[PDB]
Design an enzyme around this catalytic site. Structure first.
Site, short mmCIF file in Angstrom:
data_model
loop_
_atom_site.label_atom_id
_atom_site.label_comp_id
_atom_site.label_asym_id
_atom_site.label_seq_id
_atom_site.Cartn_x
_atom_site.Cartn_y
_atom_site.Cartn_z
N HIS A 43 41.00 37.88 35.95
CA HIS A 43 42.17 38.36 36.74
C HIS A 43 41.80 39.46 37.71
O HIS A 43 42.42 39.58 38.76
CB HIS A 43 43.27 38.87 35.84
CG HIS A 43 43.67 37.86 34.80
ND1 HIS A 43 43.58 38.03 33.50
CD2 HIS A 43 44.26 36.67 34.98
CE1 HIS A 43 44.02 36.94 32.86
NE2 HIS A 43 44.52 36.11 33.74
N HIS A 70 40.51 49.21 38.06
CA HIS A 70 40.35 47.89 38.62
C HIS A 70 41.04 47.87 39.98
O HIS A 70 41.72 48.82 40.35
CB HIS A 70 40.93 46.80 37.69
CG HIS A 70 42.41 46.98 37.49
ND1 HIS A 70 42.94 47.79 36.53
CD2 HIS A 70 43.46 46.52 38.23
CE1 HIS A 70 44.27 47.80 36.68
NE2 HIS A 70 44.63 47.05 37.71
N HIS A 94 43.12 45.19 43.06
CA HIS A 94 43.77 43.97 43.52
C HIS A 94 43.44 43.83 45.00
O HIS A 94 43.44 44.84 45.71
CB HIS A 94 45.30 44.05 43.32
CG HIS A 94 45.69 44.39 41.92
ND1 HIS A 94 45.95 43.45 40.95
CD2 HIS A 94 45.79 45.59 41.29
CE1 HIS A 94 46.22 44.08 39.82
NE2 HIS A 94 46.14 45.37 39.97
N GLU A 141 49.42 45.74 46.10
CA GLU A 141 50.60 45.45 45.27
C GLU A 141 51.78 46.26 45.77
O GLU A 141 52.79 45.73 46.23
CB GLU A 141 50.25 45.70 43.80
CG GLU A 141 49.13 44.79 43.34
CD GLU A 141 49.18 44.49 41.87
OE1 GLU A 141 49.24 45.49 41.09
OE2 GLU A 141 49.18 43.32 41.49
N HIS A 143 43.63 50.80 40.98
CA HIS A 143 44.44 51.33 39.89
C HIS A 143 43.52 52.00 38.86
O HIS A 143 42.69 51.35 38.24
CB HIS A 143 45.20 50.20 39.17
CG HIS A 143 46.29 49.65 40.03
ND1 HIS A 143 46.86 48.40 39.82
CD2 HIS A 143 46.88 50.21 41.10
CE1 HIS A 143 47.78 48.25 40.76
NE2 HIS A 143 47.83 49.32 41.56
N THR A 158 51.47 45.65 36.21
CA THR A 158 51.68 44.63 37.24
C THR A 158 51.08 43.28 36.86
O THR A 158 51.16 42.34 37.67
CB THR A 158 51.17 45.06 38.62
OG1 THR A 158 49.74 45.05 38.60
CG2 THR A 158 51.71 46.41 39.05
ZN LIG Z 1 46.38 46.86 38.62
#
Ligand SMILES: [Zn+2]
Length: 257
Positions: free
Chosen positions: A61, A91, A93, A103, A116, A195
């Site tokens: 992910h 991590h 996104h 996000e 994050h 999230t």
């Molecule tokens: Zn995150």
């Protein structure tokens, strides 16, 4: 089997995780014209001098850079927070294109990526206990735009070949997360959620206004990662972001005038 594909992406998550339609979901759009300065907010305190990174993991992910969270080695305090929150992992996104990937959004603007840094409230003893509390986590969110390279990110970039596919990990010691911060710690804050599934409403979000810059070569290397496991059909790990969710009965507060 949740993910970010054609048939299992964010709009489907509510079937297995009904809080996806809850009252305090994240991310959100940050409207800079309605977020109000809150003089009672305090600077934040980011204490990462003693941080112990351990390992980097492709979880299918994203990838997590994991820390020792068995002592107060890397803590977040102050800001909107009461007490002490331990860094457990960070991590990102990111998008398939530079015009997307974050996000949170700012006046509907999508950044190329979002970092994050995830911390848990030491009152609750362990991360698993913390995510069951409304004030269990503090997540420090930092936007990425494509421009100059971020020197402090390159060690991350250069290990990604070794964790291309889901389930691969690599040793990742002595990484300094201070090298991922912007100059300013001005922030917005609001109460929200993880999230990704299980989407638990356990997070005090602290989103920095100042983005960091990464190079187009750095983001390109992120986009070479795979969602799939080794030996499976290649699915590039891109567009691993959840879109903005309804703000509902929340206010976004600003630390700065
Ligand atoms: Zn995150």
């Amino acid at each position: 089997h949740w993910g970010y594909g054609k048939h299992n992406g964010p709009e489907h998550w509510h079937k297995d995780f009904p809080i996806a339609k809850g009252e305090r979901q994240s991310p959100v759009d940050i409207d800079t014209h309605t977020a109000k300065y809150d003089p009672s907010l305090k600077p934040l305190s980011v204490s990462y001098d003693q941080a112990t990174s351990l390992r980097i993991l492709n979880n299918g992910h994203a990838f997590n850079v994991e820390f020792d969270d068995s002592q107060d080695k890397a803590v977040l305090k102050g800001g909107p927070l009461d007490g002490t929150y331990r860094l457990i992992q960070f991590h990102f996104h990111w998008g398939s294109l530079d015009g997307q990937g974050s996000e949170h959004t700012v006046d509907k603007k999508k950044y190329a990526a979002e970092l994050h840094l995830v911390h848990w409230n030491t009152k609750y003893g362990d991360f698993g206990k913390a995510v069951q509390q409304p004030d269990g986590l503090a997540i420090l969110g930092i936007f990425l735009k494509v421009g100059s390279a971020k020197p402090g990110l390159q060690k991350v970039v250069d290990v990604l070949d070794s964790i291309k596919t889901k389930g691969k990990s690599a040793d990742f010691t002595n990484f300094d997360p201070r090298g991922l911060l912007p100059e300013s710690l001005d922030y917005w804050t609001y109460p929200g959620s993880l999230t990704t599934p299980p989407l638990l409403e356990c997070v005090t979000w602290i989103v920095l206004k100042e983005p960091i810059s990464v190079s187009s070569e750095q983001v390109l290397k992120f986009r070479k990662l795979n969602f799939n496991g080794e030996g499976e059909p290649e699915e590039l790990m891109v567009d691993n972001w959840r879109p903005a969710q309804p703000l509902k009965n929340r206010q976004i507060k600003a630390s700065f005038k």
